[PDB]
Design a protein around this ligand. Sequence first.
Ligand SMILES: *[C@@H]1O[C@H](CO)[C@@H](O[C@@H]2O[C@H](CO)[C@@H](O)[C@H](O)[C@H]2NC(C)=O)[C@H](O)[C@H]1NC(C)=O
Ligand SMILES: *[C@@H]1O[C@H](CO)[C@@H](O[C@@H]2O[C@H](CO)[C@@H](O)[C@H](O)[C@H]2NC(C)=O)[C@H](O)[C@H]1NC(C)=O
Ligand SMILES: Cc1nc[nH]c1CN1CCc2c(c3ccccc3n2C)C1=O
Lengths: 393, 393, 393, 393, 393
Amino acid sequence: TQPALLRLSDHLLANYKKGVRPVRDWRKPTTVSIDVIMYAILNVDEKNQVLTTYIWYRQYWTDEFLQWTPEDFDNVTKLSIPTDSIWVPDILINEFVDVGKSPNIPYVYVHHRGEVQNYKPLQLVTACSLDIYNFPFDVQNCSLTFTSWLHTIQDINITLWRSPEEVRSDKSIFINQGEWELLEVFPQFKEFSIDISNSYAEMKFYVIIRRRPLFYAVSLLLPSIFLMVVDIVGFCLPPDSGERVSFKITLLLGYSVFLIIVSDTLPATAIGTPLIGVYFVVCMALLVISLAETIFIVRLVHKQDLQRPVPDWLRHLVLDRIAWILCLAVRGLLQELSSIRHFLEKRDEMREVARDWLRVGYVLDRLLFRIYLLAVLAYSITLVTLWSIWHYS
Amino acid sequence: TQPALLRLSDHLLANYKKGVRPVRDWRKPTTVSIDVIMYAILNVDEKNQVLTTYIWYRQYWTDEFLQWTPEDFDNVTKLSIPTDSIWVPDILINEFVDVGKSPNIPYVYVHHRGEVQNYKPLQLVTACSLDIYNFPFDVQNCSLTFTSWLHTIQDINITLWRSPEEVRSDKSIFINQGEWELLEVFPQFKEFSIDISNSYAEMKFYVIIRRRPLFYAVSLLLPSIFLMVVDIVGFCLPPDSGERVSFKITLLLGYSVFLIIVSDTLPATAIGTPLIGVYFVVCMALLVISLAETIFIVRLVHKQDLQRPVPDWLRHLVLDRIAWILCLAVRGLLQELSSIRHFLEKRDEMREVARDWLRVGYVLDRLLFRIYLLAVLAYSITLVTLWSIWHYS
Amino acid sequence: TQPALLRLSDHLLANYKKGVRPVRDWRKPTTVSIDVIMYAILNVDEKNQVLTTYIWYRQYWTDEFLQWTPEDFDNVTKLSIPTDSIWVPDILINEFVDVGKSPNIPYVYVHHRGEVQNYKPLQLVTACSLDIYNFPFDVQNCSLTFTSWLHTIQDINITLWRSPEEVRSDKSIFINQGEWELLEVFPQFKEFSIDISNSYAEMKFYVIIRRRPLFYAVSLLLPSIFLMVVDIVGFCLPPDSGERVSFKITLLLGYSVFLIIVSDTLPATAIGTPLIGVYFVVCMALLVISLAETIFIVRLVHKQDLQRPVPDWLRHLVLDRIAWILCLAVRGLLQELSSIRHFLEKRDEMREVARDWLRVGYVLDRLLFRIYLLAVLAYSITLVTLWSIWHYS
Amino acid sequence: TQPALLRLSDHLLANYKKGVRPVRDWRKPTTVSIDVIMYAILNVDEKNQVLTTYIWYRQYWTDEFLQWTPEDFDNVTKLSIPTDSIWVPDILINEFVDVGKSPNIPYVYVHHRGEVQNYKPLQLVTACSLDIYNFPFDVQNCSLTFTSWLHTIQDINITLWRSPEEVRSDKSIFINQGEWELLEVFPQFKEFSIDISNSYAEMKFYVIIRRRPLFYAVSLLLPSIFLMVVDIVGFCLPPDSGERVSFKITLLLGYSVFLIIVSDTLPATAIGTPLIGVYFVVCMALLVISLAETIFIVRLVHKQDLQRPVPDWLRHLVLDRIAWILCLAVRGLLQELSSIRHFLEKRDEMREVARDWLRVGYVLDRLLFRIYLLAVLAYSITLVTLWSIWHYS
Amino acid sequence: TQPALLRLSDHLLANYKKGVRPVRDWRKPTTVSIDVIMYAILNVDEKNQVLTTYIWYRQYWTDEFLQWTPEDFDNVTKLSIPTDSIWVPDILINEFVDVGKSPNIPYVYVHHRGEVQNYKPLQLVTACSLDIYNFPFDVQNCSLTFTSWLHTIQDINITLWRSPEEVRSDKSIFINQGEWELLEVFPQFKEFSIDISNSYAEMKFYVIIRRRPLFYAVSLLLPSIFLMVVDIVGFCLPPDSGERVSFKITLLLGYSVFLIIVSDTLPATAIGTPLIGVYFVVCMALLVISLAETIFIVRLVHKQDLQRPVPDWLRHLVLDRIAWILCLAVRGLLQELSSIRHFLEKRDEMREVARDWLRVGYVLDRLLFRIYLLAVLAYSITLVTLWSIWHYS
Ligand SMILES: *[C@@H]1O[C@H](CO)[C@@H](O[C@@H]2O[C@H](CO)[C@@H](O)[C@H](O)[C@H]2NC(C)=O)[C@H](O)[C@H]1NC(C)=O
Ligand SMILES: *[C@@H]1O[C@H](CO)[C@@H](O[C@@H]2O[C@H](CO)[C@@H](O)[C@H](O)[C@H]2NC(C)=O)[C@H](O)[C@H]1NC(C)=O
Ligand SMILES: Cc1nc[nH]c1CN1CCc2c(c3ccccc3n2C)C1=O
């Protein structure tokens, strides 16, 4: 009879047992040939050391029992069979820490020599070690290891579909504009063993990704450069005005409020902070020097029952530092008038010695303003020198 | 016998095999005709580049084996059959990154020529690229690509149910008032291929949505306009009062606290900030100019052992800038009295030279108050000019 | 034989096909009678427009094939049958956006005329439109629409179990004390159609709920009334003390910190803020008037090389505003003494003209203190007048 | 033959129907005997009124069809059978609002008289009413009601395994150190009915738990006591120094910042705040009195063109309050000298009347410092008196 | 016939019953030998007392019914069988509070004597008690107890695969760099019993882990050391400048803002705060002493109608504390001139007595500056002494 070509499928699955590993001779292994394309990097968790990706996967193997001649079946050379009717190998990942939700694919291809092809997408929640020592300019190297979980090397061996050079140079479908950049995917065959007499075939894929360091660079420099500019403008306040101290402590208050927002959005691993955490406490201690310079000079020019300064410490300040660096009734009358002259004289002499301290506090202020402005320019061009040698190639 | 019309269903499913693709001739493909109505936009994730929608889906195909004449079955022309008793094609989406939870529909229709109709709702968690360069006034363009995952173009081809003009103009059931606005849904047929000799039918639906920019506009201008008004009122403080500097640094402190709440609720992609991030740092640097204008003028009118100002720099300030822009016992007595006259004279001459600097600091203050008020009005009407040319049509 | 009364169930399920819609004549529809009691309002999401409830559901229909006479089965009139052995209709909701987790009920009742009764609880995650224009005093109106997803009006029709007046007045089991208050549940029959020749039976239940506006009212007035009381106490500071300006800007700083916590806990839809967002910016601008009143009067009473004020602007201030509203050696001596008289005279005349400005700044201060206190009392009793007409009935 | 004792299980399950309620006579109900041990309190959600626990559950019933004599089966008196091969009753909870994830137990015991024993653990997500009127010192009373969802009182009745005194005094395995303390679990039998002619057996377990109020007490008093101590130290500043007002408004600013962190971590139900919310606004208004005492006394001792105070209001302040509570050329000369005497006399008389107001502002300051220190000590020992009568027994 | 070696599997599973515990004699128990390797510590929840790990698990037992001679089956000594075709024991954990998501392994090994080997990975969500008394330097000790949930000691007994010394010293695959450090895994056999006549075999594994205390130590000392350095610099302000009080209250404000971020990220159990919570309130009260030292000395050097100080309290301050520790018309003229001498004399004598109080306030200031600097150095080297004795071994 010739009803249709559903007479192939019941010829092929009349007495078929889906629990038996499909070989005629039990001494020969089943060889599974796999292949991978990366599709998206969904999440990189630096705190929990967990990577979440999404790949497209395919594999084939040889089934000794699903064979037919294409004649006597109207030249059919392949057909589709449900997945839960045949033997399927158990290929897992060593680095699993969870189970991702993936769509179910209910069909496979079967060619007329026994080659069974399986296509399925996979969401992977794996665990890889993440070092963040140079935090925005970092390249990560995480691994995917496909292996058979039960069967040993004498039952299931794993090979590649195609050559490892075609797998390495494949970035055709990768979803970009998403904060991570795929560089390469490199395969490598190894053989796993913990104890003796049990070896397991495995196939490591190394996934190398790189962070796009643009929006971390503007969301961490644009407040850092800004609060340095406001500190430079605050030196132009005169120190005997009672406002420079209140300026510097408010701005130092507003800067410490900023760092606790930075640590809220930027994590750190068990080795500690990255290298840019050093460059924040250098800009922190550079404001405490400007605070200690203000408190040192407000103590200087202030009116406390003063004496005339040291003639040694006036001579090499006023003269040298501006040249090397900068540019019965009758006689009862005048006895009372001499007393009135005396109270005005002590008022004037305490006033002119307050001027001599005030002249010292202004030559020494423009001296320390130019030393501070020299240090914040030498450190600023150092920070852009190290960046510009990175950016080339 | 005539028991009921359950004698149709066992005639139709006596020897039926749900794993075989239902054709008499294996050389002809099965053609699936699909159709879509968008129901809700559930979530748009700008950070992770993930779109979450909810659609209503339907499809039909032709089954060669489910055919009957309507006579000898009491004129039955269609009936309902459980879904897990027949062959169902595997239509997926390329852009899946997750599996949404959808209700199960356990029945299908079957007409008497073999047409099998399937209705089901779907929740879709897809991945599309989102550019936010003009952040509240942005139109997104994300894609849905329906394809068969295993079968090639020689087995399953995908067509539309109805015309592509009826699909494009369908906004009948879309749930509004929910922060996104559906513009159109446009279908397009393509043919997918990565390697040679394997082509897959696909059907792209382009979903174009647009953000409603109302409550982002009031939750970002109403604090931005407000802290500009408070800065204008603070110029009316007199500069030799010791409070204008403390006014400006508190208000600049409270403005920098505001931006870190803005970045907490407004994300940015890998290309960086949107265009309105430029318009925040222009309003930022416009407050530092008002801070540097205060510190420049407090340094001017302040009492430090002063000299009389330059007659050149007084003449074109006091005169020109207000006209072009603005509107033995006896002889021992008087020798002591001349000394008492001398201490009061140095007290008065240091007082009148502090007035001459104070007159300079007030002509120059109302000059810089009108230049600053001219710039904050020219920039404010520029910002509403660019908005009003957008709003028309 | 008479073994037991398991001989009923195998008589009833010997040749039973659970895929066939159970009618003798295929032209007559199956009528499903439903009923609902609301149990809890779990979540109302104003941002995503999503409602989450939990109901108790029941339904019955007529099965033509499950019929027996109660004699010859020892007078059994009903029995329980597993759910997955019989035909069950597919009743869904139009407003689904998710799938809730509900317990499984594995049994149904079957009476001896064919009536099959089904009881099950359901968790529903639906989508309804939420307007929050009057934010704590708001009544919402969301919908639940039970319909058959595949079968049309010629196969499945939906009716009510009991009368629509018994469904409307049922609040027996509703879990209270949980921030929402159930008012009524009102049913209504409609008939759904998008295209021609396909009509679907549906049954809308309108669920009307009302927010309990107690703890939103104390967590939004008790800081709003408090920072108005502190502003009233701050007018009693004297204006020529240098502390009133620093008082008002700190309190205005602490008030703007408060609103960004309010917007963090209170959402807004696409139409913008509710009506109480207007009543916050009225209390905002009422503090800027008190700030501008302080800066206007500190500029007035301050010692800058002053002149005597206008006699017109002193006469209607000092006199009128307090009445209509408030309540050779010898001749060389005295030439020097006349100079000493002259320096003390210019010191005294600049002191008495600073008193005349100081008298103006205190009559005008108590005038503007009573105008401000009149406005904050007229607006406060207006705000309680609008509340008291709401509270009655 | 005697192969093994798998000949018992096929004798026992040859013709067994798992859909039939297992009685010989259909008029007799099946009696289910249950038992509970509480294992952990996982979550108590005060906002959503949801309790999450984890119990260990067991139950037995009598199966008329699973009976054998132990002879002719090698003295087997019990054996284990898979769960999905026999009839299982449907015991649910009325208070479900979700479905918890519990491990599956695939086996049951069967004794030779028909007693079928079932052991399983359960995670329960229920809804109970939570009153938090005394927030850390609160005892909650939530309920668990086990009932049959479909079958009425004529089919399934629920009893206890063991006595209700053994269930009440069982705290053997409860995981402690986890913020809630289990007091007792008390069972009670009732009979549920909404309409007539349908009654359902139920079994309420009352679960009484109590919060451990230790770390809420130190995380709410240690900032509350601290900002009261800082306010006491700030009275020792002299009031005519211009810093006491700036002290009090900064500290009142920092206290209002603290309460918005308290409301972020401590929820409130629909009845409003707990009783300790009253004790925060008493400590709030106790700082406004210290603020209004400062502003009242800075207005007093301040130099505005003053007059001598009232002799009545000086006599009962300076004298009484310290005793009852505290402890041609020649004649042209002296006409000019009398003028110079006159300008120094008006300078001195305006200075001594500023001392007389300054003496009033210091007797009245130490008076109001001791009244304020008496109120903050009488309220502090009241707050520890109410705590110490609670702590005993 | 000799078709293949699928003739072994149908010989082995022709009449096999997967519900029967596989023994020939029912009096002998089934012995299960287990083994564990820890792979990752996923989460340690200190608030909810919940541990989340991920292990690799394996077990074997003896099946009396799956036996064959390897001859007459072409020398096959083992083969793989699906898991859902044979009897599997029910090994659970006592400490479950949830169900983790683990991958499914669908195959087992079967040797020719009946030994059935099972390999599977497991995610475990257990509940262990966590004491955090020494918060970063803490070692936890949580438990895993494998037991059979239904069967007693006469049915299932649990043993180890390999020796307990090989299990204890196994850290081969543990994923490091993830904030917790695995020390050892120690097994122990016990026997569980609540009531009489029912004993259950169990096998406790003790898991000892240790926190890596590096990044908690820098994120809690680097702001704590920093705000102590800023307080030392603030003593160099002169006390009669009106800025030291405003310095100390701003810095004390900014320190109390810091602790509420610390408690947000660091939890505490029911016993209260850890030991480092004591070391924060010691650094808290060390700033209130510096605040009370400032307010005590501003009250001292301030100009209120002063008297000369006590000669006893000047002698042991000025002299001792610097030595032991530190280093008709005519007669009408002069009657008026004596009055002018009198007003200048009272002006001078009130000025020199303000100097004598000012000298006292500076000897006493450098005295209390060196006592405070001695206490903050003795406590700082104590804090590093206790750390250095911990770090050695
Ligand atoms: C809730 O909303 C519905 C809107 O559908 C209101 O529905 C109307 O109800 C009346 C009868 O009460 C009908 O005549 C109208 O045809 C309904 N409208 C529509 C569009 O069908 C309902 O009244 C609302 N409930 C409350 C309490 O306001
Ligand atoms: C917990 O709440 C229940 C409320 O149902 C209390 O229940 C009452 O218990 C007494 C006996 O103790 C019965 O006589 C009452 O009929 C019960 N009330 C109701 C409404 O049924 C129970 O006592 C409470 N437990 C505690 C410790 O307070
Ligand atoms: C909502 C409902 N209520 C009962 N049944 C249905 C299903 N409903 C029926 C009509 C319908 C659907 C559909 C889907 C895609 C394109 C066009 C479509 N049309 C015209 C389909 O979802």
